[PDB]
Amino acid sequence: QRREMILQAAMQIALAEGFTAMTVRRIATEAQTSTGQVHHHFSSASHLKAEAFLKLMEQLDEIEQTLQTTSQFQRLFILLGAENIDRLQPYLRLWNEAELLIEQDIEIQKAYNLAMQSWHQAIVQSIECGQKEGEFKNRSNSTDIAWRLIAFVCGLEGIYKLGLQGLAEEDFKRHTEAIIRLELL
Amino acid sequence: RDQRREMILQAAMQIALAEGFTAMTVRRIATEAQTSTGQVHHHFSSASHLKAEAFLKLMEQLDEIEQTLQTTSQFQRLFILLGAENIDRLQPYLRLWNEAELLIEQDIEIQKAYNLAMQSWHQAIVQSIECGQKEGEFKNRSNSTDIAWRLIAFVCGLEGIYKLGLQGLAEEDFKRHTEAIIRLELL
């Protein structure tokens, strides 16, 4: 299909050069079609940016369910983006890129909340699976654990941006580890 | 030292709490301090320099207000120290803290004062944690420094998720989620 071929075409340029490099001329050249055909398929320049982002976070989610995880503790560590595995930094960079564009773009803002809700229910599925298999304790509401876990990993990342003195950036995995043990172990 | 320099500072803090940083022009501050524009420039290198200096004083003053709040348990003091208690008197100081967070990228003066206030915030939470441990109220699971950084990172992250307008996010659980994290860490 012509459309999905241009949908893909927006993904690798998004996954590599970023959002600002995703113009109709850039993706029509990379898809090797007329620019005219790109305006035909997609309703707007922003609509394509959001739909390339949403379908790419779904891609991130899809491979994220095909990892060799020893324990459910490991799977949840990856699910929080705290492991920073080798072939996932592109997708995580685009997620962080979309975090700043939600103020200026209404399409990107829509898809960001969409990916955030899917990220939450993916962690909710992680808490309930571990509890049903004996790996995790049942201390509190699974939904509430997931929101506090998301708030902590997003909050720890923000405190790292400030260049604070005394804090170590090598302790991100350690602090995330300790909070998970207190919540589920 | 200079009573004239302190007079302009008190005017800048007065404008900062009421309206915010954008209304803190030295034209408006000089009028508030009943002086000339040239006098403000004599004591402060810029409106941004005077903005960061007045911000540090307001956060030092907010600190002093939280400590005059008659509290009993140290676990209760940790609540107002994290800003989750929702106090009417303390709303303008917390409003300016969030306002200063958005100016750290475009203002190097305010950015310096923001990290200083955050380091003083981490100091007080460390102090309150170690005080509750000496009284046997809190447990010694981990060091006070790590728990204080984790507590600051949680409240900052929880308020950020609320800004997203996410569906099913409950703003009124800020008190509940903060009460939880404190219990897992120290209680």
Author numbering:
A (entry chain A): 8 to 192
B (entry chain B): 6 to 192
Reproduce passages from the article.
AmvA abundance in vivo is transcriptionally regulated by AmvR, a TetR/AcrR-like regulator that senses cellular polyamine levels and enables the dynamic modulation of amvA expression in response to fluctuating growth conditions. The AmvR protein can be further divided into two subdomains in each protomer: the N-terminal DNA-binding domain (DBD) and the C-terminal ligand-binding domain (LBD).
We successfully determined the crystal structure of AmvR complexed with spermidine to precisely investigate the substrate-binding pocket. Notable alterations were observed only in α4 and α6 of the LBD subdomain. The α4 undergoes a movement of approximately 2.8 Å to create sufficient space for ligand binding, and the α6 also moves to enhance compactness. The ligand-binding pocket consists of the residues in α4, α6–8, and loops between α5 and α6, which form a long narrow tunnel. The side chain of E164 and N103 in the α4 helix, along with the side chain of E106 in the α6 helix, moved to form hydrogen bonds with the amine group of spermidine. The hydrophobic interactions provided by W102, W126, and L99 are also crucial for spermidine binding, especially W102 at α6, which shifts and stabilizes spermidine.
